[PDB]
Write a protein that binds this ligand. Structure first.
Ligand SMILES: C[C@@H](NC(=O)c1c[nH]c2ncc(C3CC3)nc12)C(C)(C)O
Length: 278
């Protein structure tokens, strides 16, 4: 169905928290015999008008999204958002656990898939606003999908950037400088963040060389310091054993001015080529 009755959705466990919402593992069990399919169900835990309306927009964004590389909308219940459940979890944990199996080629396959999904999102005029390996899900050994559209905004036809009034609440190390300074978000700031996702992929989300840990190594409010470092042209170093051509792609995504960063549609072919030569 595209409309699920709540009485048929049976709670199993919590999948995650964040942005005043929660994602739960539920079984859709209209027969009530534990034979129904599993689904991920997002609900708000706050009745305030601003976040209800936000959550409604999130449901409409995802509903209108159709891509092998984007978590699938399944329907709603009335208040709750019903999505496909991916038991393999987020790519961040997947990379940490299967490190020894996943070679460079594989990482480049994941990279190309995220890029393809972001190119599509771009065409819908959708800014994701929170790209990070924690928000990428694993469909299979050779298939990933972008998720968490809790902060995603649709760009008006007349603008190509979005300005957020309140400060961001995500780890600061995935933010573009223009986001840090002016809360400007666009498809090009998504490109910046995708640079960090590339870094996460090629460090297999290892905690010791995380964006977090590397900043503390490079060393006043942390946010200002981060802006300073990036202003000087300090960047994250090549992940250990990273192919040079991949690191250069990262640095391109980390171009100080948004209009100097490659598009996802330009990034895509490069990744596919690197993957075919690995
Ligand atoms: C991106 C968010 N996840 C989702 O929206 C999900 C949608 N279907 C899913 N299936 C499995 C998972 C496992 C990782 C738990 N997360 C999700 C969240 C931040 C809760 O992981």
């Amino acid at each position: 169905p595209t409309i699920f009755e709540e009485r048929h959705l049976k709670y199993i466990s919590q999948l995650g928290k964040g942005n005043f919402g929660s994602v739960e593992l539920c079984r859709y069990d209209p027969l009530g015999d534990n034979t129904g399919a599993l689904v991920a169900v997002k609900q708000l835990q706050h009745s305030g008008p601003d976040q209800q309306r936000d959550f409604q927009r999130e449901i409409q964004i995802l509903k209108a999204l159709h891509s092998d590389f984007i978590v699938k909308y399944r329907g709603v219940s009335y208040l709750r958002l019903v999505m496909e459940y991916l038991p393999s979890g987020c790519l961040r944990d997947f990379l940490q656990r299967h490190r020894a199996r996943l070679d460079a080629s594989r990482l480049l396959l994941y990279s190309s898939q995220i890029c393809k999904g972001m190119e599509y999102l771009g065409s819908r005029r959708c800014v994701h606003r929170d790209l990070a390996a924690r928000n990428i899900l694993v469909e299979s050994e050779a298939h990933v999908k972008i998720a968490d559209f809790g902060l995603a905004k649709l760009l008006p036809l007349d603008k190509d950037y979005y300005v957020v009034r309140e400060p961001g609440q995500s780890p600061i190390f995935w933010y573009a400088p223009e986001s840090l300074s002016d809360n400007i978000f666009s498809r090009q700031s998504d490109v910046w963040s995708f640079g960090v996702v590339l870094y996460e992929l090629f460090t297999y989300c290892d905690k010791s060389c995380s964006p977090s840990a590397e900043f503390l190594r490079m060393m006043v409010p942390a946010l200002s310091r981060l802006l300073e470092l990036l202003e000087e042209g300090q960047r994250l170093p090549a992940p250990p054993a990273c192919p040079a051509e991949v690191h250069e792609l990262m640095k391109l995504c980390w171009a100080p001015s948004p209009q100097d960063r490659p598009s996802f549609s330009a990034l895509g072919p490069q990744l596919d080529m690197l993957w075919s030569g690995s």
